[PDB]
RNA sequence: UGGAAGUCGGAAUCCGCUAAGGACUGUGUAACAACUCACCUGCCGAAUGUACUAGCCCUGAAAAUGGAUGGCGCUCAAGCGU
């Protein structure tokens, strides 16, 4: 599946329709559906970002 | 380009004997090769070529066509 | 004075005529008659 | 991108179902008078056939929806005709027999609920129960390594067979969508599959110019049917199970018997 | 001649008309001749003539032709031998310049009263004498150029500033506004588009049209009409004075 | 004491048509909710259809009317099933409309038509219906227009 | 600056005062410039220019022909194979290449 | 093809005196005199009519025939210069640094000199010396305008082009930096 | 090109974040308190990117 | 004053909808355009909801 | 479509008035507006337009000591065809 995800996305929606002078993309692709999910996802993302910063600082 | 104020090395129009002989030999070989290809040519050729005809700017084309009709009717009557 | 606008802004330029170096060799009536003969022969 | 409903006696259009952004590639008509469409705009829609209005719109597929199948297709195709070979006398009791067969095929937990499977070019399938689950899929069927061309429920409603472009036919439990076994042996993409009436056997016609009959309870290749000299495009099994028809690029109908 | 202008091929829908349009005009005029009692000739000289659509709509029972002058003259017939009806070749002497034909069944008095009472103020074309002096005031340039007061006027669009400079106004862009000199109306005088009694040129008329100032009037002048019943041409006041060929 | 005429496009049966109007009628002194309610009341006949609405402004109250357009009249005459515009998108007007109500739409649009006769008005309405994408009498409105032009189908005069 | 700042400056201040006429004059000189390039470039640059201009003429002629002809699958496949990328698809047991150039042992 | 005879005509106004000798054209009017040597073009001059100057080429190629149009326009421009004159109006615009323009007339040479300072804040002083016969005036009707007037269209337009080309923005984005001096109007003095 | 024209927002500094519907005065407030050249216009969605 | 083109009820509804994003932050509702309509001119029920 | 009015897109692309005008050729607007092109009329005035063919000329690739139609030089030739 991840062998073909990239070409599958490009076949579903090309580069020119996504960004550029002739782009038709209006809705983004989100991993959240509700405001509560967005808040939880944001706080988990901040925690993961801080953890990775600490790992790179230790390394 | 700065050709006038600073010209480059000239290109010699003076030939050499070796180059002349090689060019003549290769021209004769190409002539023989195209003769062979003309002999072995698979392309279709018409038995009679398409004649261009009478030019339009010729002033007496219409009277010439009148004549041509006259000899074709005369030949049809004679035959 | 002139009433029109010239595109390049050189308003002093005169009203130029067409560059026809072969002008005046043949007449209009003779050319019409030659047109008729040409169409018939074609 | 439209599905038109025609009155056969008059030849006139009653309803036009539009709303798809791509070509509608597959249409089914259920026994609860609902029209299911799958399209190349990656969507599967459920329409009310009486009113001509949209009921459900599923947009879970990631590529072209190639085929859809209902859990009651086998009985809806044959109506009141069955193994008895005798038809009822009048139209009312014939319709009653047809409705009884549809309900017996479509009962879930004692309630009539048609189940809809959709196969797509995103290598996957989705299983839907619009009556009980709404827009939430029952399961996502995963495991094909290439595009899934054809999909079909068994006549007893317990199994689902899928044919893929990864040279494979796969078997799935029709209730929870879990993978069961892989029918391996084709060497070119499998185009069509068809069930037997007793749900023991599935026949698959592929691009490798062959038909293969698979025993699904044992999981093995029961029979191999060569003879086509080119690609096989259409395969059907008779409702009484006597004959199998195949047709394809070799221009000749081939009929197969025991 | 290797050195020549590259002729532009237009990738547009509408093509050139040719002889088919001329024959169609001939056939339409010759088929509208027998259906009407009077044929008026009218003139609209040095006028925009976009109100002839409204004239056609208001005179829905009449037929109006506004094609080529020579083509309409040849459709009617310039000599008694080739004329379509008796006495039509007398009517062709008015067909010079910008003319039109009006086939009608009404009495001529209604037509004359209608075209005497029809008045429409119009944008002046080049060659017209300016009736008054028009001056854009110094400061911020507005849409009408000072015809309506600025408290009711709207600032002119910023996309017209290169066109105003090309037409000769020394305007500039100040913080998104088109201004004549300074924003406070200083360091410059007003811009006189035209003076009273001055023959307008095309640049001045273009400036007037951009500023939506109308200095002329759309008038349809009837020269003369041919009646089929008497087979004769009656001349009118405008056709009495207009030159004929 | 002046009259201000404002033209807009609205969908019948909604209030949010005044969302774009409220920037400009605010300085004019109009109430956005009042003019939205007036627009909805005037366009309740044209539910689900994009229609043209004229507002006349005098003494800081608005009078709201609906200007008939050929496309809106044809889509209304198609008698499509009701739908929710947020969930039913990319629809097509592929139903059929009869030539008699096409003539009725032409009679309604005579006040805008510059054509000399009702035959020309009917042909304009047929071209508009062809652009919409519907059928006339089960056939293509271009085909009925060609039949009317060639004389197979007659149109009543006025 | 941020976002479309050059467009905002373009809207607030315009162009240079000679930009339109200057671009018009350059586009007018473009024909003489093309002829000078055709007659004056040398070497590989000239060869690439001539090849590019030949291609431009070919596509221009194709576009003109299509605009002239504005006012005027192959093999049967099933519906599930429609709209996909399908191949075009076009005793003496002789091989396609019966004879090739022989190779000596020294080569 | 060689054309046997080709002819051009130049009308001359009543207040103009034209003297042509050995293809040296001297045109005199109310505003002064202009002089142009046209001996690089093979042309026969004549007086075909009172107030009309005739130009002939005999047995000339197409290029030689076409050169007569250039000669006609040059002489007509000389006539327009000595009757009505030529006038070029230039506007200098700036964003932040005001452009300081000083116009002087040099005593020993008789030509005008234009000094430009503070162009985009530069400390250099640009100096352009006008062609003789060209008068430069800082306008009083409008803001930030120069007026270059004269009898020679060549001299007036060349002086305007020199003023335009000395103030070039260098190594900066020309979409953003709009500073410069540009020709705004071209016409006749009268 | 879009990344080159993107504004620089430090996510760990002192920041006022102005939000709401269109046409309520957000860009007017930002113009009045800062030096940013965000346009102020009477139509909705005048501002289409973060300033 | 509702000259933005949206109802104040919808403004309160949007604020309540995006309130879960506003945790661990400070929130200030700024009522703009007091030159058009004051808060006291608003009816008591809407003022009560805002409070 | 947040907005999209011929001119961000997808598909259709008809009728009227016509003298003629695309459900639009480009510039432009957030969207409009505005300008422009296709096409038509008025002025003017007599020959033109397009594509190919044949000649001669330019380009159609060049390194490295300073140099070669044999050299000077030659331009209605002292070059090219008869
Ligand atoms: Mg705003």
UniProtKB/Swiss-Prot annotation, chain D:
Which Cys pairs are S-S linked? none
Where it sits in the cell: the answer is: Nucleus, Nucleolus
Q: Which domain of life is it from?
A: Eukaryota
Query: WD repeats span which residues?
Result: 19-57, 92-138, 143-182, 185-224, 227-258
Identify its protein family.
Belongs to the NLE1/RSA4 family.
The record describes its quaternary structure and partners as: Associates with the pre-60S ribosomal particle. Interacts (via WD repeats) with uL18. Interacts (via UBL domain) with MDN1 (via VWFA/MIDAS domain). Interacts (via WD repeats) with NSA2.
Q: According to its UniProt entry, what is the function of this protein?
A: Involved in ribosome biogenesis. Required for processing and efficient intra-nuclear transport of pre-60S ribosomal subunits. Interacts with the AAA-ATPase Midasin, which is essential for the ATP-dependent dissociation of a group of nonribosomal factors from the pre-60S particle.
Would you tell me the protein name for this molecule? Answer: Ribosome assembly protein 4
The protein's organism comes out as Chaetomium thermophilum (strain DSM 1495 / CBS 144.50 / IMI 039719) (Thermochaetoides thermophila)
Indicate the span of the full protein covered.
Answer: 260 to 517 of 517
Swiss-Prot record, chain E:
Q: Does the record carry Protein biosynthesis as a key word?
A: no
Q: So which domain of life are we looking at?
A: Eukaryota
Q: Which GO terms describe its biological process?
A: nuclear-transcribed mRNA catabolic process; ribosomal large subunit assembly; rRNA processing
Family, according to the entry, reads as follows: Belongs to the universal ribosomal protein uL10 family.
One example of the protein's molecular function in GO is: RNA binding
- Gene3D superfamilies per the record? 3.30.70.1730, 3.90.105.20
Subcellular localization(s) per the UniProt record:
Nucleus, Nucleolus; Cytoplasm
Nucleus as a keyword of this entry, yes or no, is yes
Keywords (alphabetical) are:
Cytoplasm, Nucleus, Ribonucleoprotein, Ribosomal protein
Quaternary assembly: Associates with the pre-60S ribosomal particle.
GO cellular component labels:
cytoplasm; nucleolus; preribosome, large subunit precursor; ribosome
- Pfam families, per database record: Ribosomal_L10 (PF00466), RL10P_insert (PF17777)
Regions of biased composition (Basic and acidic residues) lie at: 237-245
Main role? Component of the ribosome assembly machinery. Nuclear paralog of the ribosomal protein P0, it binds pre-60S subunits at an early stage of assembly in the nucleolus, and is replaced by P0 in cytoplasmic pre-60S subunits and mature 80S ribosomes.
Report what the protein is called: Large ribosomal subunit protein uL10
From Swiss-Prot, chain I:
Q: Where does GTP bind?
A: 20-27, 45-49
Residue ranges of coiled coil: none
- Which residues of the sequence carry a binding annotation for Mg(2+)? 27, 47
Domain of life of the native organism: Eukaryota
> Where is the protein found, in the record's own terms?
Nucleus, Nucleolus
What function does this protein fulfil? Involved in the biogenesis of the 60S ribosomal subunit.
Q: Which family does it belong to?
A: Belongs to the TRAFAC class OBG-HflX-like GTPase superfamily. OBG GTPase family. NOG subfamily.
What name does this protein carry? Nucleolar GTP-binding protein 1
* Species name: Chaetomium thermophilum (strain DSM 1495 / CBS 144.50 / IMI 039719)
